[PDB]
Paper text:
Azoreductases are a related but previously thought to be distinct group of NAD(P)H dependent flavoenzymes that have been identified in a number of species from bacteria, to mammals. In order to help understand the mechanism of quinone reduction by azoreductases the structures of paAzoR1 bound to two quinone substrates (UQ1 and AQN) have been solved via X-ray crystallography. We have shown the azoreductase family are very active NAD(P)H quinone oxidoreductases with broad specificity profiles and as a result they may play an important role in detoxifying the quinones secreted by many of the host organisms of P. aeruginosa. paAzoR1 has a preference for benzoquinones e.g. Bzq.
Residue numbers in the entry:
A (entry chain B): 2 to 122, 131 to 187, 196 to 209
B (entry chain A): 2 to 125, 129 to 189, 193 to 212
The structure:
Amino acid sequence: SRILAVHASPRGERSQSRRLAEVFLAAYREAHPQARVARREVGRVPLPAVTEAFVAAAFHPQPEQRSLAMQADLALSDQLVGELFDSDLLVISTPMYNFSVPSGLKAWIDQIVRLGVTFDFYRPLLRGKRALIVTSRGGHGFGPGGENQAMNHADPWLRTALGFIGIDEVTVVAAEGEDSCDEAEQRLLALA
Amino acid sequence: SRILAVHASPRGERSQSRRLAEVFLAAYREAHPQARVARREVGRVPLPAVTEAFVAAAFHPQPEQRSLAMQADLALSDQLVGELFDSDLLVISTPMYNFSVPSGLKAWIDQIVRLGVTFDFVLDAQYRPLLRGKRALIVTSRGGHGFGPGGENQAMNHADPWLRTALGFIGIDEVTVVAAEGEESSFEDSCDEAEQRLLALARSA
Ligand SMILES: Cc1cc2nc3c(=O)[nH]c(=O)nc-3n(C[C@H](O)[C@H](O)[C@H](O)COP(=O)(O)O)c2cc1C
Ligand SMILES: Cc1cc2nc3c(=O)[nH]c(=O)nc-3n(C[C@H](O)[C@H](O)[C@H](O)COP(=O)(O)O)c2cc1C
Ligand SMILES: COC1=C(OC)C(=O)C(CC=C(C)C)=C(C)C1=O
């Protein structure tokens, strides 16, 4: 199983979402020694936002006739999509930032949801892929049945976006109160 | 009554959310010649993302003791927050990108939600908003249909509903949403309706 790990926290050593994700990846590597891991940093690296140029090229009515300039505008997107195609398991580590994800992760999603590549018209085009979302939160009760579940626009939105392109087998492991981390940690070891 | 307009679409003349928002601002201008209008571009301008240095600065236990480097890391945030404090009405124009907002608008939000400035907390964490007496108008454009209340795809909409939650957290709980749908394809009717709604809001604000 080939893995694509997308880290969304701008923090490095201090990132809990990053740490917990690495705990899973390490535990998984031991259980599957032949596994490959590709890491795509979107937290500590400023992934470019969608531009009007991107929109013109991505939604170009006839893709084959794109100019070299248009292809250049889509070069990063193609690289990012390719990493996704080449993977079997998608691991996303992300904090909750203002009831959603950090802007860098939104930028990544906006690059890999591509007409005619990951979706068409609406139907998904990705198949046989699973996702694991490892998230960290300062507050409490954003999970299923929580007092503040309706305010959660982070992982539940990722489900929607990922589901739209065909990734419908998604698991979310969440730590709150920043004991919950230990539960998350142990949970992740079992999954690996 | 002072207005802050935040445009989130990367498109210019062809941005429908920008166009509709400008219809409101112009109509408002006609009814209030003395009113001040400030524009903050987050769509055609790449707003910096929250970094680790920003987190270290914004959550510093003794904010008075921040080094000049730390203050530099917060200089943009301080400017963005200030524009908001100076405003009575906030106008956000935004597309729906992949069931949420463009990353640039998310970045703007992440800059203006600030500990001890736009929100605070005490330990008993019990959060408190610090903005008062302000209102917001969200003008949005969508390619598909049914993302509004009662719509078939309502549960998929993580854009304007999410903006409501984030804005409410810092104290802006009076929020109006004007949406146009079917841009991908009727749309002329949706736009005309949104226009009439905005012209009415402008005349009465
Ligand atoms: C800019 C910013 C926004 C945040 N917004 C929320 C939030 O909306 N809800 C919440 O529960 N925690 C919020 N937090 C707290 C973080 O989610 C929490 O500290 C988390 O552990 C960070 O994960 P990390 O260690 O991987 O960086 C926020 C933190 C920052 C820096
Ligand atoms: C990257 C991208 C993602 C989009 N995602 C959605 C979507 O999830 N749902 C939808 O109804 N329309 C979606 N659209 C269509 C836009 O919402 C629509 O074209 C809108 O009018 C753009 O706003 P603007 O005219 O202000 O630029 C998307 C468009 C782009 C370019
Ligand atoms: C920095 O910004 C924010 C936090 O920082 C720690 C939070 O914990 C939270 C969590 C709030 C709840 C209701 C527990 C929010 C919402 C937030 O915006």
